[model samples]
Target: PRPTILLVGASRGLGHAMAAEFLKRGWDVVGTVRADRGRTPLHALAEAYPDRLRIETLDITQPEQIRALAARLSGRVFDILFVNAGTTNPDPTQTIGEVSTDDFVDLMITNALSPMRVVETLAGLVPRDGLIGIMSSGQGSIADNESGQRELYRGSKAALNQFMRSFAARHAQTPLAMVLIAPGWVRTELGGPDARLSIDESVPGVVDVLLAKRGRAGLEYLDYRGRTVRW
Candidate 1:
């Protein structure tokens, strides 16, 4: 059988683009959308690639939702499980000190806690040689922090990175590859208008990096071009 990937959060933006890219390379993709979304780009993509693309509903922040999704797909063993669910603060200009507690809580739950829960819950569906990946960010690199405007956003991703690293440590003897991808400053709803790269430019490299590193056991913090990011 051909390879299959269970991709989380593919309603729109970078996640939608990644779903399309993987389908173009002949992968069977099972992608998720927020249950609240309607008439999303993924619906169109599903129509276009009806044979290989399947859609599921999820709100990544909900643990019960993940478990339900797990039950629904229990029959299949996917080749890769890549999480693209994440969010940013509504006001980027707010410093960590100035940011409200609610904003901080929401951002961390969306970016850090929930995604890991998805990975943890859905992990059984990935076979022995399968891979696990999450959409991390370049801003997650603590050592590379030259300027700090989005401290909350950065901190959440950093927390995800650390959580994944700790997860990786527990599975070191296993043959499953694990990666935290930094997809660069791409222009997306979350990335804002002035972001450096287009989704087309970044998404392809993101797919390439995952494809390149598949079957390799260990964890890496890498950019779209597959360069290592500092911890």
Candidate 2:
């Protein structure tokens, strides 16, 4: 069988773009969405390449859902497991002080805790030498966060970075290569039109970095070009 990637949050937008990019590279992709929701862009994409792309349903906000997905993927050995899910409030320009408590809790759970649950539950499905990647943003950098726009979103990813680092420390002896990818400022619903990188330009670089991570151990905060992101 060809190598496979278990891609979380691959319904539309950048997630769908990454799904398409990975499949074009000849890696079979097992992608997930929040739910079937009648049909999504992922569903349309699935129709075109029935063999190359497989779709599953998940709502990462729910820990129970992640546990169920882990059960269903029990025996599979994906070459990589990349989590590409995260969302911001309707108005990303809102300062952290202006963010409602409910929104703050929602962002933290969706961006950090849920991805951690997914990785921890499904880590066994990837062998020690395989990769476990998280879709982070350049905004996730704590040391690099001089500009405080998108502050709540920024804190959430930073939270993910720290949690993943702790996960890495626990598995340091293993050969697993874990990465927190900073995909730069891309033009998407999340990134907005002012963002510099297009999905086409940015996501292919993500695939390339992930491909290069094979057998390399430890965790890193890396950009799409495989350059290190500041801690």
Candidate 3:
């Protein structure tokens, strides 16, 4: 049997693209979607790869749903755990001050706290030598920000980076490797129309980084090309 992968947030954007790629490569995939509204794409994928694709409804922010999902898949382990569920703030047109506090709170939950929670709850589902891929952004880098765009979004991801680094340190003895991958300015809804990278070009690189051999359990941040990110 092919290796199994659990991809969180596969309803849209990069997560959806990653799921499709994994299916094409003949890997068993479990993809999560937030609601039934955005599920058409995932369902279509399931139709294409019925044997490999398993779709689950998950609101990453909900602890109960996460626990239930974990229970449902008891004793199942994946070769990789891909965390790609996230959101953007400020609606693109809104400036820093114009961004709502509610939006900031929601963004922090989905982008920062929720991913950590998922790992904490589901890390055991990965084998000792498996990989955990966290979808972070270069904008999250505290030491790399020059333009100061989207402060709340940047801050949330920065917090996620710190937490992921700490999580890696705490589990150094385990064979699992944790990676924070930045997909760059991909031309998606979140990236806007003029973004540089395309999904086809970026997904392969991100997947390569997820599968590459590593010696230690430190948090390594990289772009789609597996190049080390400046942080």
Candidate 4:
């Protein structure tokens, strides 16, 4: 049987593209998206693979929703669970002094806490030898921070990285693998125009890393190309 892959944040950008790639490669794909976002693309996906694709309404920011999703998905196991949902507030025009506390907290909630919530709630759904992946960024690395640009995104991703490290350490004996991935600056709605990586170029690498890292643990932070990222 083909592996089942669950990808959270499947509405747009890299997450959407990764879902498509996984389905094309014959992996059973279950994608979660916000209920308010148009379901047309998801519907089309379901139509294309009636047996292989399932879309659920998921807003990871809500703990109640995560718990409900966990309850609803009980008894099912996935070969891979991808927490790819994230948001970035990149105002190149603004410095640390200009960023608001509310905006910073919101970014962390969406990019870090929500994904962790999903992991915590759905840990049982990951098969004994399954993989769990969280999307992260280079800017999130305090060791790599140069210009202090994208502070909201940077801090959120950093926190996420730390969280992954702790989770991996705590579950060292488990069969589940946890990893943090950085997709670089892909040209997406979030990446803007100057980004070099095309959507096509990024998805394959992301999928490869997820598949390759199964059954492994520790903070495996890598780029879309599976290259090691600076902590």
Instruction: Compare the candidates by lDDT and give the number of the best one.
Output: 1
What TM-score quantifies how close candidate 1 is to the native fold? 0.98
lDDT of each: 0.93, 0.90, 0.84, 0.82
Q: Residue 78 in candidate 1 has what lDDT?
A: 94
For candidate 3, write residues 1-231 as lDDT tens digits: 688889988887798889988777778899999874664578888898898899988889999988988997899989888889888875744666787889878888989999999988988898877788789999899889988877788888999999998898888777767789989889878888888988888987777677673434556888888888876
TM-scores, each model vs. reference? 0.98, 0.97, 0.93, 0.93
Ranking of predictions according to TM-score: 1, 2, 4, 3
Report the lDDT tens digits of candidate 2 across residue range 93-149: 889989889889989999999999999988989998899999988898989888788
Error in Å for residue 16 of model 1: 0.4
- Candidate 1 Cα misplacement greater than 4 A, ranges: none
Ranking according to lDDT, highest score first: 1, 2, 3, 4
Q: What range of 10 consecutive residues in model 1 has the weakest lDDT sum?
A: 31-40
